[PDB]
């Protein structure tokens, strides 16, 4: 039985590959061939926020499309007012090694985490006119990579011990644990209906999870290196990923396979972050060569370049109303484009 | 601007002063990275360290400078995903235990990756050889042939220790990096002086290469 089970595993893998082949009749490039291109897209820098003294690792927009938070290796969290470039809050962090941050949809909480292996929750709206720590979540055996809010009482985290978890803030415990990855989980993304989420790890694969039952639905493998970023389509039936092999790919859920590949011969550097537009016609990616490219999501053609940084672009972001794009970098600066 | 808009602008100015003060108070520190296999003497490298499973930070003060030491051994994951967080440190401290023939060929393997890393092209290394006394008493039983098979020489105390030092220094292939080596026992107390002198030579060399001499 120590070898009979292995034979059945290879048999089921071949059935899946043949089933996907039968569902492929035409490519997306063939279908969308008779569409006028979007053209040339040029964007200018409208704001430049200063005040950080080290590398910037993460940022997140608010649901009101005016407020945003950012994290840096100087041990500070800063909340900005993008319209007037005013600083609202500056929260000192106990551990200076930070890798991710999040902003609650309601607007009353923020999240932080890093090499300490604790996710920390901060209370913004309270008496005494100051920000105080509300909860410390412990239980991961590796560094925290990403975190996202579902409500004011639920949060999902990914870590470097090849697991994902869902927590209850008041109790301080984790209700569900998601397992199956082989390498370190690096990125995470939530669906608009918040009933499923997708993850990508260092085993060059992506998995679809069910929040309630805590099971695994589908697995996607098309890359050749580590996966760093992931994002959902606004419709909710597709997602995109970025890897270290200088390539972005688009995956479909109902067809359960890959649809498009975005690549060029002049790029040999990795991809740090990806994001979509409000309509879904544009895909934005940040690279290691200090730039940011704009792709046509339906025709796999370059449209524009955003070049204003002196070091590596670490993070991206698009407002809920699709009016601006924010970028962060290792030169302690973050800019707002339009 | 309205009455409340002017009040908000004044709040941002005070936050900008606190941020400026904290940056000044942080630039006058020396950051060092502590690496090595388990049971190599990392925890007791300096007698007067004070702690201030993730990352462990120990700080001590000497002369007038402030030293910060970071220990990362509790992260059993891929180093390449977080090794870039320590790109701007002054130097790297490496510890090797000479009484253990099992950790060998693993300490050498770990030393090779650090010395040939993309983010550490021009970072010097301060190398510590620990437990020389117990290594000397052990050599009367195992003549270093068990650990290193390709060894031919008079192995009393020195040619054995000289061989180990030559093995680590051969891993460096670069003209802008220097390796500092020192042998310590379990009772030596002048470890802070050795670190102080090595850092002083590092800053001098960095200043010459900024004026076109090296």
């Amino acid at each position: 039985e120590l070898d009979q089970l292995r034979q059945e595993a290879e048999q089921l893998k071949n059935q899946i590959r043949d089933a996907r082949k039968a569902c492929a009749d035409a490519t997306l490039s063939q279908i969308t061939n008779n569409i006028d291109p979007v053209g040339r897209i040029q964007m200018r820098t409208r704001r430049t926020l200063r005040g950080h003294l080290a590398k910037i690792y993460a940022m997140h927009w608010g649901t009101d499309s005016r407020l945003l938070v950012s994290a840096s290796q100087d041990g500070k969290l800063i909340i900005w007012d993008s319209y007037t470039t005013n600083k609202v809050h500056a929260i000192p962090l106990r551990s200076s090694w930070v890798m991710t941050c999040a902003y609650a949809p309601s607007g009353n909480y923020v999240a932080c985490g890093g090499l300490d292996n604790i996710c920390s929750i901060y209370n913004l709206k309270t008496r005494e006119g100051n920000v105080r720590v509300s909860r410390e979540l412990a239980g991961h055996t590796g560094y925290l990579s990403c975190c996202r809010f579902l409500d004011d009482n639920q949060i999902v985290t990914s870590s470097g011990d090849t697991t994902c978890a869902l927590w209850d803030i008041e109790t301080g415990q984790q209700t569900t644990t998601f397992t199956g990855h082989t390498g370190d989980v690096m990125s995470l993304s939530l669906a608009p209906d918040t009933r499923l989420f997708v993850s990508g790890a260092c085993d060059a694969s992506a998995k679809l999870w069910d929040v309630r039952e805590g099971m695994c639905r589908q697995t996607f493998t098309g890359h050749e290196s580590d996966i760093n970023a992931i994002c959902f389509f606004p419709n909710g039936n597709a997602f995109a990923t970025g890897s270290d092999d200088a390539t972005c790919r688009l995956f479909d859920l109902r067809a359960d396979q890959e649809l498009m590949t975005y690549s060029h011969d002049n790029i040999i550097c990795g991809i740090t972050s990806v994001s979509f537009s409000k309509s879904g016609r544009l895909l934005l990616a940040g690279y290691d060569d200090f730039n940011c490219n704009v792709w046509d999501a339906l025709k796999a053609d370059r449209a524009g370049v955003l070049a204003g940084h002196d070091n590596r672009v670490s993070c991206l972001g698009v407002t809920d109303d699709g009016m601006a794009v924010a970028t962060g970098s290792w030169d302690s600066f973050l800019k707002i484009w339009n | 601007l309205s009455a409340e808009d002017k009040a908000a602008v004044e709040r941002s100015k005070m936050i900008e002063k606190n941020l400026k003060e904290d940056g000044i108070s942080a630039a006058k520190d020396v950051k060092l990275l502590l690496l090595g296999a388990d049971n190599s003497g990392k925890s007791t490298i300096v007698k007067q360290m004070k702690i201030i499973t993730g990352i462990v930070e120990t700080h001590f003060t000497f002369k007038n400078l402030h030293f910060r030491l970071f220990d990362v051994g509790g992260q059993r994951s891929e180093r390449k995903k977080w090794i870039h967080c320590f790109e701007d440190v002054t130097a790297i401290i490496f510890c090797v235990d000479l009484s253990d023939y099992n950790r060998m060929h693993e300490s050498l393997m770990l030393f090779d990756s650090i010395c040939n890393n993309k983010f550490f092209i021009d970072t010097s290394i301060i190398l510590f050889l620990n437990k020389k006394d117990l290594f000397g008493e052990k050599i009367k039983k195992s003549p270093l042939t068990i650990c290193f098979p390709e060894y031919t020489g008079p192995n009393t105390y020195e040619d054995a220790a000289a061989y180990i030092q030559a093995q680590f220094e051969s891993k460096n292939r670069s003209p802008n990096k220097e390796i500092y080596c020192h042998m310590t026992c379990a009772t030596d107390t002048n470890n802070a002086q050795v670190i102080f002198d090595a850092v002083t030579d590092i800053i001098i060399a960095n200043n010459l290469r900024g004026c076109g001499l090296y």
Partner: single-chain antibody, 230 residues
């Protein structure tokens, strides 16, 4: 949160006194502070204001050159020095805290005052002076001499309630927003120069005097006050 004021008493005309206030339960250094007085036969009147960091000081036109305001952060104390006291200065003096950033709620906490006895502005008009009125709906109105709608999209109108034998408390800020710890039956609406406050499903403990204030520019002005009686 607690604010306690000390001082007061009987002072001869032409004299001088000093008033103090003590804070406990919040961060005193991140708040601006105000002084507001209430004559025995009048309503509320603004006096002075000192900013966080002591960078800005404002005075009313009728206390300029006579009164002084200062703060002490290590000891958590606010001061007020008065000289050349006339008979019109007899009132009860309150101490109010306020914070200023995007989305905040200034004028949110008031203290219990101390009595003192001595032997181009915008005009806010509240036409109603008394209304006899349970289980019903009432509406109050306030008027302005100039439009309070700024070019940034904010209307700077504030409401307050003063129960008998108590200190005033905040109900509505910026003409629409509802303060914390206030039942949802209070609502606010209006436009430039015309404002209204609506109370639905009236209950007990809602009796008292209601005031409208503007925060567009200094000095800050109040209304006459409308009284609700059973």
């Amino acid at each position: 949160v607690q604010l306690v004021e000390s001082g007061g008493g009987l002072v001869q005309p032409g004299g001088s006194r000093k008033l103090s206030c003590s804070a406990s339960g919040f961060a005193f250094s991140s708040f601006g502070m105000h002084w507001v007085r209430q004559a025995p036969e009048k309503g509320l009147e603004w006096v002075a204001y000192i900013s966080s960091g002591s960078g800005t000081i404002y005075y009313a036109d009728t206390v300029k050159g006579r009164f002084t305001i200062s703060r002490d952060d290590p000891k958590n104390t606010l001061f007020l020095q008065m000289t050349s006291l006339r008979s019109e200065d007899t009132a009860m003096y309150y101490c109010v805290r306020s914070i200023y950033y995007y989305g905040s709620s200034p004028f949110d906490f008031w203290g219990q005052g101390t009595t003192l006895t001595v032997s181009s502005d915008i005009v806010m008009t509240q036409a109603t002076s008394s209304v006899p009125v349970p289980g019903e709906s009432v509406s109050i109105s306030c008027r302005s001499s100039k439009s309070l709608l700024h070019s940034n999209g904010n209307t700077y109108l504030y409401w307050f309630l003063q129960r008998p034998g108590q200190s005033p408390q905040l109900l509505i800020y910026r003409m629409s927003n509802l303060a914390s710890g206030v039942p949802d039956r209070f609502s606010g609406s209006g436009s430039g120069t015309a404002f209204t406050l609506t109370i639905s499903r009236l209950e007990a403990e809602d009796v008292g005097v209601y005031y409208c204030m503007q925060h567009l520019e200094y000095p800050l002005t109040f209304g006459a006050g409308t009284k609700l009686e059973l």
